[PDB]
Design a protein around this nucleic acid. Structure first.
Lengths: 53, 70, 92, 173, 49, 239, 58, 107, 78, 197
RNA sequence: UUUUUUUUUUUUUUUUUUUUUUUUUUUU
RNA sequence: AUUAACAUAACAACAU
């Protein structure tokens, strides 16, 4: 419940900035890692192969 | 079904308290239509709200008549 | 709370237009926390808006640019009066 | 504050409008009786765990009767019986409270203003009657004359409001 | 994921045993409790080696 | 039903102080909290009579704790609002207003009517001493004293009735045993007023009753007329 | 009061009363009511003629 | 009578059916073959033709109401703000790579 | 349980009046009195219905012109 | 205007996803807010706040003003009347054109305006006001710095810490899973099986 | 501040406690 | 247009 609350405020702020048209700046800090699978790396190879073909 | 051939009339027999209202989706759809007319420059809401025999040129209403005493 | 007593504000600065301004601690809209605020009031003592140190510093940088506009637009304004009067005084 | 009562409401309103257009006095019209007539039914299916019930709807027709109270009858019910409607009394009280009338009307409507005034008036009437002081015919004539004069003045003023000529007014009334 | 809980696997006397750790009170709290339980097992010497 | 069960069951039953609401307590409190902010932003709300009698409990406490002007009280006030607009209004328009009002800043008015769709009672929850109020409010403070003095000076009956009361307020001259002649002598500065700090411009503002007016015309509808939206959208049936 | 009908209401019963509403009592009560009702009228002491209503079509 | 029925005025903005999401394949101009070049504006030959008749500079046709200010490269920023392409500009400093750890317990 | 027999007409008749009195004493009578109180106050005006509804009013009409003294209408001006 | 009246093509030329979806809906309401003749908006970093210089319409002298009307009093503008029907009938213009006639205003009042992220008017400033404000800038920085020192931390944190240090804090159970025929004992044991060679 | 036994008190009266009903009115 | 079952209404009654 608290996380779903904080997300809203963050989003609101960001949206306000976008509307304003200010330079695009974000929180350049240590982000978490909610993912587990290497989807991007696994996905690139298929395009490589396809191209080859 | 439009043809009215399925067993969709069974549930309706029993009483109900209320039903859902897709306001969220409807609002969006209305907004999109409004935008599509606004880009051309015609007010749809205004025409959907004005009194039968009412004439209101441009962005005008009750408020307009306030200062326009003369 | 709103009314700043003599011991809660600085000297009010009057403007040609009658608008007043002072410095006092105001509850920010964010959370209601007190911070140094530059309050602006009209002739009838009504709140319009406020700034802070950051905002004022930012604005001070932009002030020069804005000044040119005052001179620029003035010309246009002046010329519009000539365009109106040339036909008003020649075809009335 | 019901929904299905609208059907009755509409009949009532239509009857009042038709009677007013027919020239009868709607202020003296009372509901006599009523009558109900069965029309039919509309059955619908209703499935259950081990049966299929039948759900239906009702259909009825209402017949109403109206009667106009002559002057004679009217007098006897209001003056004697004091069976005045509630609407009239509410109207009177409203006017009095809002100062729409003078001090002279309170006393005039005293016989029909409130229940206490009605009761005391009736007791005084009885005493007068026993004392051979009260004249039935005189009271009836005064009542009828006042009502007819008010009705006539209403129409005369309504006609004068339109700016009609003296000849038109004389020919109309 | 379905049980929404942490588990600790350790071998004692040639027998497999697993303990429950409900994470409803807190993810970090349950994780630290499980880690502390495993460390206590290893320190007291109840894990085969 | 039968209309008799209601009476039969109600025998020897105590009344509830706080009216029950649909939902969990956490939901109920949220509901009331949001409705308090919405009431602060409007000046009158139309609500059911039971609900109107319930929201007034917190409507009074908000203003009661807003006037203290203390860090502690500030916290409690913070703990009862959501949007910044309500905070701004409460702290800039309502606090100055009820400077001299000890309590009772709100009221409930019954409409004596039933809803078309629900057949439910209706009522209005309007603040006291606000523009376009249903009924006027009584004076407080020096205004009250002036009113009382006026009443006294009007007639003998008023004088007699207010004799006792007037003594406390000081409207009676003890040196002569008569009502004070000059009432302006009892004037004192209120909190609402601005303490003393101690043009030929064409852009000068023009005095006007609520707020001043600019010397220029701007093509803009009022705040309440520049943002349109459909109130409700029909939902087509699926036969 | 406020969203609640009064608990101390009195609902009439056409066929029962705490003071007794038996057949025998009904007779008496009806008799007295009729007697009182009748007396409320005030008829004139002098009339010239009496004319009745009749429906020619019927 | 029905103000919503105006296909001529609304153009393709609406679907006139139960299409919640529209579909639009790539355009001719968008495609590689017979497609408008992103760098041909600065060429000598086109300017010759375009003599006091048309400006080929894309910087003179940028919407101001839907564009953000230029950020600093040094500072974090989005890619989609102004970069209308699919390749990292050389101006951008070096970026580091992060590899997910599948078996952190081995440490 | 299940009914053992059929209800007579008499019983139903009785029930009808019982129910009518029950309802009248508790619903209708309260509603009537609540309705009648609103008369003092101005009529109700809805914002939603403004598109078709008549302008607002305060003054109440008189249903019984027979007992309505004082002027009824004003003479037209010259 | 933030939109091009009668634009080319058969589709919108602007994004309609994300925040832009909201912004389009917000801006469509007011098709004429931004004067045709206006300076570009200049937003500030911290809080969405834009500045722009424009020209406002004239107004009637207060002398000739009737008075405040309605809940939002406003002075009337200074404009000339439209052509009358008698002249418009003889005019060669079409009915469509004739019906679409409006007044004519005078825009000769130059002013600076400050808006929010939403381009919502907040305040208006003139040349004299702007010049006057510049002479008091150094006097305001010192006052702001002096007032900054009067702020103190929030005692909420300390009071909560003391409360939790010198008060009780009960904790309830969570996730009380039930069991079927067989009950639990805190720990479970696996099974042992032999291979088939 | 409320409820409860897990606390406290009684174990007396029966012409008592209590109560819906004034009856010289033999044809309301 | 149409019988019964069924549904509503009006009138008629006094040694009570």
């Amino acid at each position: 419940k608290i996380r779903q609350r904080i997300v809203r405020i963050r989003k609101r702020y960001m949206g306000q900035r976008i509307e304003a048209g200010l330079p695009p700046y974000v929180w350049g800090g240590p982000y978490p890692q909610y993912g587990r699978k290497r989807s991007l790396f696994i996905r690139g190879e298929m395009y490589r192969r396809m191209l080859i073909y | 079904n439009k043809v009215r051939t399925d067993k969709k009339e069974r549930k309706r027999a029993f009483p109900q308290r209320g039903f859902w209202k897709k306001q969220n989706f409807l609002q969006v759809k209305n907004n999109t239509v409004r935008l599509a007319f606004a880009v051309q420059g015609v007010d749809l809401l205004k025409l959907k709200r004005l009194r039968w025999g009412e004439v209101r040129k441009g962005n005008t209403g009750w408020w307009t008549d306030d200062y326009r005493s003369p | 709370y709103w009314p700043p007593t003599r011991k809660d504000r600085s000297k009010r600065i009057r403007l040609p237009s009658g608008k007043k301004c002072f410095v006092f601690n105001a509850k920010r809209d964010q959370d209601g926390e007190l911070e140094p605020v530059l309050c602006f009031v009209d002739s009838q003592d009504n709140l319009l808006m406020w700034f802070n140190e950051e905002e004022l510093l930012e604005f001070e940088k932009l002030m020069p640019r804005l000044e040119s506009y005052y001179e620029l637009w003035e010309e246009k304004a002046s010329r519009t009066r000539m365009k109106e009067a040339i036909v008003a005084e020649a075809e009335s | 504050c019901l929904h299905r009562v609208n059907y009755l409401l509409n009949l009532l309103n239509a009857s009042r409008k038709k009677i007013h257009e027919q020239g009868g006095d709607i202020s003296r019209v009372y509901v006599e009786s009523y009558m109900l007539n069965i029309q039919g039914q509309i059955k619908r299916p209703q499935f259950r765990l081990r049966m299929v019930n039948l759900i239906k709807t009702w259909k009825f027709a209402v017949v109403l009767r109206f009667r106009e109270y002559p002057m004679d009858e009217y007098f006897h019910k209001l003056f004697i019986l004091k069976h005045v409607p509630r609407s009239l009394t509410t109207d009177m009280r409203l006017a009095l409270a809002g100062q729409r009338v003078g001090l002279h009307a309170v006393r005039d409507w005293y016989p029909f203003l409130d229940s206490k005034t009605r009761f005391f008036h009736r007791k005084r009437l009885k005493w007068l009657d026993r004392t051979r002081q009260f004249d039935y015919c005189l009271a009836r004539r005064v009542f009828k004359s006042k009502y007819e004069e008010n009705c006539r003045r209403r129409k005369i003023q309504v006609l004068q409001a339109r700016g009609a000529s003296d000849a038109v007014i004389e020919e109309a009334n | 994921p379905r049980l929404n809980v942490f588990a600790v696997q350790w071998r004692e006397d040639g027998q497999h045993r697993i303990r429950w750790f409900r994470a409803a009170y807190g993810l970090t709290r349950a994780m630290r409790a499980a880690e502390n339980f495993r460390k206590t097992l290893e320190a007291t010497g109840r894990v085969d080696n | 039903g039968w209309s008799k069960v209601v009476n039969f069951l109600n025998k020897g039953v105590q009344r509830r102080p706080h009216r029950r609401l649909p939902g969990q307590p956490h939901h109920q409190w949220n509901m009331l909290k949001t409705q308090l902010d919405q009431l602060v932003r409007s000046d009158r709300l139309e609500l059911t009579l039971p609900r109107a009698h319930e929201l007034q409990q917190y409507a009074e406490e908000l203003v009661h704790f807003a006037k203290q002007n203390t860090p502690e009280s500030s916290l409690i006030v913070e703990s009862m609002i959501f949007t910044p607009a309500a905070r701004r209004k409460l702290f800039h328009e309502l606090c100055p207003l009820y400077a001299n009002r000890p309590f009772f800043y709100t009221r409930v008015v019954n409409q004596h009517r039933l809803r078309m769709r629900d057949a439910a009672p209706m009522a209005y929850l309007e603040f006291v001493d606000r523009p376009g109020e249903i009924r006027p409010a009584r004076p407080v403070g020096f205004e009250r004293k002036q009113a009382i003095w006026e009443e006294m000076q009007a007639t003998r009956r008023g004088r007699r009735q207010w004799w006792n009361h007037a003594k406390k307020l000081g409207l009676i001259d003890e040196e002569t045993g008569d009502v004070i002649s000059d009432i302006n002598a009892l004037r004192r500065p209120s909190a609402a007023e601005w303490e003393e700090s101690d043009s030929p411009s064409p852009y000068k503002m023009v005095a006007a009753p609520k707020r001043a007016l600019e010397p220029f015309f701007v093509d803009l509808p009022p705040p309440t007329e520049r943002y349109r939206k459909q109130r409700y959208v029909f939902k087509r049936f699926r036969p | 009061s406020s969203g609640l009908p009064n608990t101390k209401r009195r609902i009439r019963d056409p066929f029962w009363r705490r003071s007794g509403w038996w057949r025998w009592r009904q007779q008496e009560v009806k008799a007295m009511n009729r007697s009182r009702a009748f007396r409320r009228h005030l008829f004139p002491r002098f009339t010239t003629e009496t004319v009745s209503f009749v429906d020619a079509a019927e | 009578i029905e103000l919503a029925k105006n296909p001529d005025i609304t153009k393709h903005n609406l679907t006139y059916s139960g299409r919640v999401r529209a579909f639009k394949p790539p355009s001719a101009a968008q495609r590689w073959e017979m497609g408008e070049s992103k760098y041909a504006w600065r060429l000598p030959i086109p300017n010759l033709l375009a003599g006091d008749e048309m400006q080929l500079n894309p910087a003179l046709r940028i919407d101001e109401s839907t564009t953000q200010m230029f950020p600093d490269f040094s500072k974090p920023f989005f890619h989609n703000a102004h970069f209308n392409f699919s390749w990292k500009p050389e101006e951008v400093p070096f970026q580091q790579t992060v590899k997910l750890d599948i078996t952190p317990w081995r440490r | 349980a299940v009914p053992k027999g059929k209800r007579s007409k008499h019983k139903c008749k009785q029930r009808q009046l019982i129910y009518f009195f029950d309802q009248f004493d508790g619903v209708f009578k309260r509603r009537r009195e609540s309705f009648y109180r609103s008369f003092y106050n101005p009529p109700y005006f809805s914002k939603q219905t403004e598109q078709t509804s008549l302008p607002p009013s305060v003054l109440r009409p008189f249903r019984f012109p027979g007992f309505w003294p004082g002027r009824f209408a004003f003479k037209m001006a010259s | 205007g933030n939109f091009r009246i009668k634009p080319p093509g058969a589709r919108h030329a602007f994004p309609k996803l994300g925040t832009h979806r909201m912004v389009m809906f917000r801006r469509m309401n007011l098709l004429n807010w931004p004067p045709e003749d206006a300076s570009p908006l200049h937003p500030i970093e911290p809080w969405g706040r834009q500045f722009f210089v424009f020209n406002a319409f004239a107004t009637i002298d207060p002398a000739d003003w009737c008075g405040p009307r309605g809940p939002f009093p406003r002075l009337p503008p200074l404009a000339k009347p439209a052509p009358d029907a008698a002249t418009l009938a003889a005019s060669p213009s079409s009915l469509l054109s004739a019906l679409r006639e409006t007044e004519e205003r005078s825009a000769t009042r130059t002013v600076m305006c400050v808006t929010d992220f939403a381009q919502r008017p907040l305040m208006f400033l003139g040349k004299d006001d702007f010049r006057a404000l510049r002479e008091n800038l150094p006097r305001i920085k010192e006052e702001l710095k002096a007032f900054k020192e009067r702020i103190q931390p929030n005692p909420v944190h300390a009071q909560y810490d003391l409360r939790r240090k010198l008060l009780v804090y009960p904790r309830q159970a969570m996730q009380r899973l039930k069991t079927g025929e067989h009950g639990g004992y805190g720990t479970r044991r696996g099974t042992i099986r032999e291979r088939k060679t």
